[PDB]
């Protein structure tokens, strides 16, 4: 599970950044470490399970994003670089 | 030794000196450290290792790192008429490393 927060530069003046929760499955885990801006492609769905609807108050729901692809918005070398 | 706010587990964390083993540790405003920071810096520079005895844990960690520091003279201006030892708030044991 990963939490995404808006980039502070893009927030119009006077408002606060929003955020969401993201789900990464299989080989999408441990790809984006904290502190880097990324682009995430996924399916926007409710937390349909929730907990239960016997809870008092207005019937409101929480939502998540299930990620399909992730990308980033080095000190290694090779023979080509070694010769140079 | 400090709690993890999300996993609710105790953890052992070293300082920037332990974390930068085989690296470089940058310290800004070197003239404003407090007693604990001064002691940690002195131990790291003299022994290249940091000790700890806290919360039932006794161990030593490696602190083999390079240090680049910046400071300011007393009063904010350099007095060229006096030796460097009298221009900064630092002491000889640290300044000689």
């Amino acid at each position: 599970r990963v939490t995404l927060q808006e980039a502070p530069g893009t927030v119009p003046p006077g408002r606060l950044p929003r955020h969401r929760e993201v789900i990464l499955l299989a080989d999408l885990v441990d790809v984006s470490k904290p502190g880097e801006e990324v682009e995430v492609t996924g399916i926007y769905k409710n937390n349909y399970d929730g907990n239960l609807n016997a809870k008092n108050g207005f019937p409101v729901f929480a939502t998540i994003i299930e990620a399909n692809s992730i990308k980033r918005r080095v000190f290694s070398w090779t023979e080509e670089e070694e010769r140079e | 030794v400090r709690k993890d706010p999300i996993t609710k587990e105790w953890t052992l964390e070293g300082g920037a000196l332990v974390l930068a083993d085989k690296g470089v540790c940058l310290i800004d405003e070197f003239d404003k450290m407090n007693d604990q920071d001064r002691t940690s810096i002195h131990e790291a520079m003299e022994q290249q290792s940091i000790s700890i005895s806290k919360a039932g844990i006794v161990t030593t960690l490696q602190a083999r790192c390079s240090i680049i520091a910046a400071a300011n003279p007393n009063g904010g201006r350099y007095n060229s008429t006096l030796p460097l030892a009298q221009n900064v708030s630092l002491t000889e044991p640290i300044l000689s490393r």
Partner: protein, 137 residues
Amino acid sequence: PLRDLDSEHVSKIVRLSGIIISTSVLSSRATYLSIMCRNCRHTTSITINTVSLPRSCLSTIESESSMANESNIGDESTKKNCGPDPYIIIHESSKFIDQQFLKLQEIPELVPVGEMPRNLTMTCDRYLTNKVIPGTR
């Protein structure tokens, strides 16, 4: 590395390195239990080497004897039912072993910047208890 464990390793054998940061107190677990039924006093035993005490008395399915069939009925028409969870443990005739928990995390030198170290829970028993102390690699 502790950070490389993942799904492919589940139920296999692994070799890991780290530093011990916490050992717990010794627990007690059973290796041999002698039990009895509080209604009809039928006795049996259990050996461990998630076991639970029987949900029902075992004197019916176990046709011990011909007179045991007689003993399982009495006083006119009423049937014999010992109830749910009829067994109790006779402690003075049982055997127990030792158990412990440990915590292992990654070496603090190589942790990535901006993130706290990861750790894992470990369980050992019998002759592997009280072997190390926190701060050991």
